[PDB]
């Protein structure tokens, strides 16, 4: 559980300087606080992963220095037209999920990844409550069997949280929300890598996102590519 | 070289165990050197052959100062398996069980080997293990058991300047090292201090499992020993715990003729199977 | 963690009680046996393997467990009979100058064989491309350094963890353990356990000239009578304890009941009193 | 936790004699005084199942 401001609209692009407090420590070990810009519709896009050395993107958002016990990402002077949500990641302790933060409305105005590797899903329309539905993210580019991928779900209103982490070939750790009812099974090592529902408990209605890279222990990986999600729409 | 052969007299009776005994007669059964046997007369006047190490060897050395030094005991003398390169350097003895195969030739500076592999024991013993017409005789009995490599030794300052041959006189050997390293040993290799910049000749016998009756002195040393398979007199002196046999007839062990062949006789092969009439026809079956 | 020592220690008296006072250890959970009985069990050779991990990774060192370090740098099967001795070292291994010396091999293809050391530095190749050496979008450095700093908290501090793997092959055991001793008692029938040689007797002073290699000693007919002191050189004598036969002389239970007791083989000083042959 | 398992004892047990114990072991001559220090725990190790 982290601390994030509910909304931020006063003084657009001049004194916003949003952050995420509630850490009360030194970010554990490796000080790598990422910032995700979740936009309605398409999948979110990475903005910055470390305190400096911003990746290839917009150059008007940098200087994410860690002041006190929170990383204050300088966003002033960026623009005056944006409708998205900024999420920060911290608490890099061993086997600790829910590294994301609450929904921070950083809309300065309010009113006013595609062909990189691949983007495919299962399209679970009208999912029957229970059963076993499989969702895949087959990537014809980067290997879907060697890199460290993850699965993160998000629901309308609620923020993101770590749902599934899988290492190279010898780890099948599950999140604390499922506590065992979720079983990850890897597909063929040269075709794709899919997931399994395993008799959901009516809380899996959130939309899924299969990310090719980790969230809290995020590595450069050349580029951060995401994929669009699908609505479960359970009928329990 | 055409290696000669000499008659090994009564020499090589070592202490089997470590037990004090005074004025007794102990009949032991263990690996000893048979009395009046043939021992190769390898002369070091160049020579460095590989000898078979069956169950224990008896090495001799009549060097002057530092002619014969070192032992290259091992199984195959290769880099795959381990070996033993106990050498005698300046007032010290180096004992390592590393698997140093070879460099060019067993000669010696550490010119015996040139490589680097994993070792198992580096018990470098600091105390060394080693008069005009006064040579020096050094006898070494090497024995190997399931978990130890025993090396008995004895140094006697011989006096007689006769032609090079084993002298006449009983002389036991005292244990000095009891290396518990476990490794298969089947080959023996010797080497001399070349130092290029009849001298000496080593005798290499072979041990056999035999019974020996040893006489302990009041002090606790072995004064003499009698074999049990050399002649009827030795068998008579072994069957009775006394070296002074009285006049008479004594019943020694029994003799038996051993088989030499095997005969297995069965009745006369007849009543042949009708299979000959089965595999030869025109219409067989469906 | 990628290049850890494999010290093969043998031919010594392994006294594990001394380890409880060398350094302020924080974890001494031995999974195989108890430290009290460990000092009385012989072994051939102990494999000491040391490394440095964080505080939150010490829990990953267990006989069978997954993790970023548990199956990528050092794995222990379900047979480890040693201990998980570990201690914090945040007193001399943390300076503010840039700690780009360590690594933990974040990238790997699969779980390594347990008890294996992979000393490699090649660029991680993530398939579907021949990487003859390049750093972009397909092949990266499979190694990453830590961020150990002195001004941090518990959990992410340098913790030195050393394991002691035991083995019992078809080889003579060298490292057994401590061998205590007791005081000497002379001219008194007591028990003795001299180097496995157990028995009872009266340790007296003898004048026998033992050989410098002999330790024990027997008699004419299969009876140990003198041994060498495992301490400083001294020639002793082990004579049997005070024993003998007892006979009773009785005039019969028809005139009186006074009886006489005869102890055979005694000079009346080892049990009126009379001394006869 | 319903299936208990005792730990090592400084003395051998007796045949047909129950070994109910609830104190803390004391290694050597250093009493840990209830709190489990070094080489001193409670012989109430719970068996793990799966
Ligand atoms: C030791 O052996 C010698 C051999 O000649 C003997 O004379 C002596 O009596 C023995 N014992 C002593 C007193 O050294
Ligand atoms: C069986 O007897 C026949 C006739 O004496 C003989 O020729 C044949 O060799 C014999 N085979 C044996 C001895 O088994
Ligand atoms: C053995 O220990 C005792 C302790 O007093 C010492 O006096 C003696 O010299 C030692 N001897 C050896 C062989 O270390």
Numbering used by the authors:
A (entry chain F): 3 to 114, 124 to 247
B (entry chain B): 24 to 68, 79 to 141, 156 to 177, 181 to 247, 261 to 349
C (entry chain C): 350 to 620, 641 to 646
D (entry chain A): 449 to 498
Provide the publication's sentences verbatim.
We determined the cryo-EM structure of the prefusion stabilized SARS-CoV-2 Omicron S ectodomain trimer in complex with the bispecific antibody GW01-16L9 (FD01) in its native full-length IgG form, revealing 6 states of the complex with resolutions ranging from 3.47 Å to 6.11 Å. The epitope of 16L9 mostly overlaps with the RBM, while GW01 binds outside of the RBM. From different states of the Omicron S–FD01 complex, we revealed that two scFvs of the bispecific antibody synergistically bind to two distinct epitopes and induce the RBD-down conformation into 3-RBD-up conformation. Thus, although either 16L9 or GW01 alone could not bind Omicron S tightly, the GW01-16L9 bispecific antibody could bind Omicron S collaboratively with the help of each other.
State 2: up-up-down RBDs, 3 scFvs, 3.70 Å. Following that, GW01 binds to the “up” RBD-1, inducing it to a wide-up state (via an ~13 Å outward motion) and pushing the “down” RBD-2 to the “up” state to bind the second 16L9 (state 2). Then, the 22-aa GS linker between 16L9 and GW01 guides GW01 to bind to RBD-1 and push it more open to accommodate GW01, which unlocks the “down” RBD-2 and induces it to the “up” state (State 2). Thus, another 16L9 could easily catch the “up” state RBD-2.
